[PDB]
C-alpha cells in the first residue's frame, strides 16, 4: 500500500558519455549532447500501478520557463513525438529502464533533473541530479552538424594544435595546447556564459539563446577578451609586458582559463591575437562547436569602412605611425562550423569569430559570426562584422610619403593584392599547413576579385599616373638571421630607363612588434648610386648585434626600409620585414611512451652568445602527457655552454600527443619547442 517513491538512480555515466562522445573530459559529471537519447535505470519502491504516473522536469539557468525552452515537463511514456521525451524501455521488479531524450534545439549548459510522482491522488517532486548538455556535431539535425568523421575528430576532439605565424617571407608555426579535456576547463568555459554582459543584464533571455551557436559563438568572441566585461585575457601589443607574461611565452589555453577563474575572474596578462584565438578555440571545441584557428598574413585593420588602408613613410625612409588603420604581419582568428538560419542555406559552414579586441560591434569588443562564403562573394551587408573582416583579408593598401616639415603628404602607390595572403590552418590529422585563401577571396589578379571588391565597397557608406619608374628595387637577405649575429642584407637597384640615373637612397631599420607597432630605430644610412641604362647595383646593409640587441622584442622582427629617388620622378619605396632565429631548443623522449608509465624527456639548449644567460626558466605542458604546467629552474649558462635538463612526464591518454616547451632567459624571451609523442597503449 506504500505510496510510489524513487529509491535510487543509475545514470550509467561511463556508458552514456562514450555514446555521446564526451568521455574524454576529465570530469565526474554526466556530460551529454543535445538531440540524443541517454539511458538510466531508476529503482522505485513498488511496481507502477494504474492511477500512477511519473513526469520528468528539466531546467537550466536561474529563470527557467517552458515557453523559452529552458524548462521542460515530460511524462514517462512510450511516445517520443518532439521536445524532451522519456521512454519506458522495460520494467523488471521495481526497476525501470528509461531512455531520456532532449531536442536538437535545446539550450546548452548545466541542467537539473527532477521527478514528479503521481500516486494515491498525491503529487510530489524529488531532485534526481544534474547534467551538462552540449552541442551535438554528430547529429544530422543539429545546427553544428559536421558529417565527416575525420574532420569532426580534428575540429572537436583534438586538444593539440598548431597556429601559423611569422611573415609572408617565412611562415613558422607554434604548438598550442587547447586542453579542452583538462580538469575544470569545460566547467570554466560554461562559466564564461554565466558572466557575460548579456547574462548579467537579462539572464532569462541569455540562457534561452544558448540553443543558438551563432549567439554562443558571438558571446565567446566578447568574453575571451578582458575589455568591457572582465573577460579572460588582457591584450598588450606595446612591447612592454611588465606585470604579466610576454604573450609569446604562453603555450596553451589551460593555464590562461584556470588563472582567470582562480583570480576571481580577473583578466590574465597578457595576450596577442594567437593567444585569444587559441583560448577561443578551446571554449568552442569544449562546448561542441567544431572550430579551427586561421592565420591571415598581411592582415589589414580598416577603421573607417572603406576597404583601404594607408601606410606612411618619411623621405628619410622611416615608417610612420600615422592614421588609425594598420597592416599586421599576420593576424589570427577562428572559424566555427554551423548553419546560418539567419542568412540562408548558401551561407552555412565556416563562420569567422574573433576574440581579439579590434573594433566595437554594437558597443562591445566582439566579432562575428561572419560567413566565410559570404565574405568571398563580398555580401558584406550580412550579420556579423563583415566590413571589418573583408578588409582584413582583402583591403587595398595605399602607400604615402609624409614630410612633417612641410605638412605635405603625397600618394606613392596602390597595392591591390598584398593584403591577405597564405591564409592558413592546420591540416586534418597532421601538422601540415592547409591554405584556405581561396575560401576567403577570388584569386588575386582575376576579374572576379576586382568585381567582388567593388560590390563590397558599393555596399558601404585626383592623381596623375606618372611614367613607369626608372628604378626598380628589392631587398635580399645575405646569410643567416639569428639573434646574437649580425644582420646582412643587400639592396638591389636597377635603372630601366634609357638615360644614366643618379639614385639617392635613405635607409632605416626599426624593431617592430608583429602588428607593426614601431619600437625603436636601430640603424640608418644614406647612399647615392649612379646607374647606367639597364645597370643593376648592390648596396650592402649591415646591422650589428650591439645595434639591435637592446630594442629587439620577443617578436625578433626588424623592419628594413629604403626610400629611393631620382630627379623628376616619384620616390620608390622598397620594404622588407625580417625575422631573426632564436637559438635552438630541442626536446626528446629517451624511451617509447606508454600510457600510465613514467618516461624521461631531455631538453637541450646551447647559449650561442659570448655572454652568459641568466634567469633561465623552462615551462612545459601537453595534454595527455603531463597534468598542468611544469616549471624548471635552469642555472645560469656560460657563453657557448649547453644545458641538458631531464624531467619525467606520465602519459595518460594513448594516441599522438604534443609536448610543448618555453625556454625564457634574460637575453632570449620565449624560445619555443614542440615534440610529437606517440603514446602506445
Amino acid at each position: 500500500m506504500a505510496a510510489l517513491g524513487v529509491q535510487s538512480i543509475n545514470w550509467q555515466t561511463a556508458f552514456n558519455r562514450q555514446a555521446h562522445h564526451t568521455d574524454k573530459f576529465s570530469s565526474q559529471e554526466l556530460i551529454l549532447r543535445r538531440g540524443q537519447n541517454f539511458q538510466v535505470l531508476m529503482i522505485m519502491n513498488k511496481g507502477l500501478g494504474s492511477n500512477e504516473r511519473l513526469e520528468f522536469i528539466v531546467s537550466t539557468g536561474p529563470y527557467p520557463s517552458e515557453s523559452a525552452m529552458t524548462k521542460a515537463v515530460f511524462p514517462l511514456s512510450n511516445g517520443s513525438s518532439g521536445g524532451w521525451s522519456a521512454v519506458l524501455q522495460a520494467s523488471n521488479g521495481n526497476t525501470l529502464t528509461i531512455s531520456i531524450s532532449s531536442p536538437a534545439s535545446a539550450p546548452i549548459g548545466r541542467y537539473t533533473m527532477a521527478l514528479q510522482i503521481f500516486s494515491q491522488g498525491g503529487i510530489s517532486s524529488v531532485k534526481l541530479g544534474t547534467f551538462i548538455l552540449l552541442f551535438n556535431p554528430w547529429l544530422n539535425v543539429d545546427s553544428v552538424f559536421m558529417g565527416n568523421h575525420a574532420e569532426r575528430e580534428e575540429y572537436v576532439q583534438e586538444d593539440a594544435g598548431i597556429i601559423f605565424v611569422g611573415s609572408t617571407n617565412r611562415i613558422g608555426m607554434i604548438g598550442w595546447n587547447f586542453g579542452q579535456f583538462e580538469e575544470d576547463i569545460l566547467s570554466i568555459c560554461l562559466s564564461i556564459l554565466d558572466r557575460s554582459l548579456n547574462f548579467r543584464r537579462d539572464a532569462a533571455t541569455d540562457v534561452a539563446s544558448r540553443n543558438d551557436p551563432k549567439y554562443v559563438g558571438r558571446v565567446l568572441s566578447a568574453m575571451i577578451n578582458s575589455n568591457d566585461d572582465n573577460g579572460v585575457l588582457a591584450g598588450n601589443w606595446s612591447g612592454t609586458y611588465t606585470g604579466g607574461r610576454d604573450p609569446r611565452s604562453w603555450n596553451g589555453s589551460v593555464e590562461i582559463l584556470k588563472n582567470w577563474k582562480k583570480s576571481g575572474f580577473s583578466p590574465v596578462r597578457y595576450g596577442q591575437c594567437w593567444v585569444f584565438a587559441g583560448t577561443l578555440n578551446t571554449a568552442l571545441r569544449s562546448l561542441g562547436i567544431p572550430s579551427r584557428v586561421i592565420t591571415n598574413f598581411n592582415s589589414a585593420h580598416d577603421t573607417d569602412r572603406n576597404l583601404s588602408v594607408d601606410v606612411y613613410y618619411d623621405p628619410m625612409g622611416n615608417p610612420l605611425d600615422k592614421g588609425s588603420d594598420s597592416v599586421w604581419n599576420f593576424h589570427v582568428w577562428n572559424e566555427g562550423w554551423f548553419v546560418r538560419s539567419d542568412l540562408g542555406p548558401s551561407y552555412g559552414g565556416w563562420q569567422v569569430l574573433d576574440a581579439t579586441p579590434q573594433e566595437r560591434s554594437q558597443g562591445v569588443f566582439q566579432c562575428g559570426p561572419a560567413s566565410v562564403i559570404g565574405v568571398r562573394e563580398g555580401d558584406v551587408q550580412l550579420n556579423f562584422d563583415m566590413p571589418f573582416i573583408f578588409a582584413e583579408v582583402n583591403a587595398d593598401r595605399i602607400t604615402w610619403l609624409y614630410d612633417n616639415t612641410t605638412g605635405k603628404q603625397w600618394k606613392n602607390s596602390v597595392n591591390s593584392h598584398t593584403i591577405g595572403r597564405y591564409i592558413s590552418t592546420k591540416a586534418v590529422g597532421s601538422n601540415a599547413r592547409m591554405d584556405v585563401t581561396d575560401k576567403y577571396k577570388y584569386p588575386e589578379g582575376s576579374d572576379q576579385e576586382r568585381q567582388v571588391f567593388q560590390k563590397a565597397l558599393g555596399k558601404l557608406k585626383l592623381e596623375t599616373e606618372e611614367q613607369e619608374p626608372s628604378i626598380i628595387g628589392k631587398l635580399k637577405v645575405a646569410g643567416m638571421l639569428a639573434v646574437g649575429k649580425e644582420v646582412n642584407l643587400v639592396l638591389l637597384l636597377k635603372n630601366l630607363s634609357r638615360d644614366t640615373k643618379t639614385v639617392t637612397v635613405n635607409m632605416t631599420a626599426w624593431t617592430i612588434i608583429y602588428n607593426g607597432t614601431l619600437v625603436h630605430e636601430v640603424w640608418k644610412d644614406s647612399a647615392t648610386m649612379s646607374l647606367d641604362p639597364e645597370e643593376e647595383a648592390e648596396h650592402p646593409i649591415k646591422i650589428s648585434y650591439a645595434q639591435y640587441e637592446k630594442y629587439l622584442k620577443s617578436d625578433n622582427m626588424i623592419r628594413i626600409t629604403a626610400v629611393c629617388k631620382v630627379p623628376d620622378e616619384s620616390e620608390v619605396v622598397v620594404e622588407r620585414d625580417i625575422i631573426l632565429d632564436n637559438p635552438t631548443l630541442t626536446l626528446e623522449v629517451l624511451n617509447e611512451a606508454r600510457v600510465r608509465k613514467p618516461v624521461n624527456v631531455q631538453m637541450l639548449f646551447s647559449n650561442p652568445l659570448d655572454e652568459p644567460v641568466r634567469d633561465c626558466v623552462l615551462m612545459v605542458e601537453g595534454s595527455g602527457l603531463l597534468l598542468g604546467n611544469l616549471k624548471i629552474d635552469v642555472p645560469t649558462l656560460g657563453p657557448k655552454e649547453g644545458s641538458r635538463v631531464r624531467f619525467d612526464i606520465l602519459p595518460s591518454r594513448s594516441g599522438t600527443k604534443q609536448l610543448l616547451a618555453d625556454f625564457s632567459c634574460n637575453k632570449f624571451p620565449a624560445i619555443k619547442a614542440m615534440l610529437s609523442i606517440d603514446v602506445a597503449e
Partner: antibody
Amino acid sequence: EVQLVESGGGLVQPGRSLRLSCTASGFTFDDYAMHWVRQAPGKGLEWVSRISWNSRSIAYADSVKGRFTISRDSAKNSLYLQMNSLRTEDTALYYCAKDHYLGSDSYGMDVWGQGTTVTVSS
Amino acid sequence: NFMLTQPHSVSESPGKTVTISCTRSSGSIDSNYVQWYQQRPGSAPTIVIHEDNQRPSGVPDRFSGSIDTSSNSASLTISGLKTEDEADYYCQSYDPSNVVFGGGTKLTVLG
C-alpha cells in the same frame, strides 16, 4: 636566486611608529605583487598586506587597516610598511614575501625573507 | 571572507604516508588556488605546493597536493616519510581581497 632583506625592525612603546623596509633582488620586482606576513612568537602565520605589481591595488588585514600603509619603489626595488599607532599585539617577526603569480591576481608567497623583529611593549 | 581549518597535529612513522587537510569555511575550495608551506624552527616558511597541486623546483616528488570538492578541502600528502619531514605545515588561499592562512599543523614523524 631571489633575495628579500627586511630592515627597520626594533622596540617601540605602544602608540609610536616604525617603518619597515624590504630590499628585493634576483627577479624583476615590478612584475609581482608583494606582501607582508607576520608571525608572533610561538604562533601561526598572519597575512598583513598586499600591493599589486603597479601599486594600484592594495589590501590590508582588518587588524591593521587604517594604521599600516604598504608601498613600494621601483627604482629602489624595495617594499615598505609604515606602521603607526603600534599596539602590543603587533609584536611579531615581519616577513617580506614575493608573490608566486605572474600576470594574474591570485596570491601565493614563493619566496620569503628571514624577517625583521618588531616588539611593542611599555 | 573565509577561514582555513587544519588539524592541530598529525603523526606517522618513517616510510609511511600522512595527509594534512585544509577545510575552507565558506565559498568553494575550488574557487581559488591553494598553496602549502613548510616551516622549521628558526626559519622562514618555504613553499612546497603551489596552484593546488604543482611542485616547485627542488621539492621531492614525495610531496603532493590535491583538492576535494565534496569536503571543501585541500590536502597535502607526504609519502615515504623521513625524519627531516617533521615540521609545521600551513595551507593558504585568498579571495580577490584577502590572503588567508590555515592555523598550521605540526607533523611528528614517530621516533
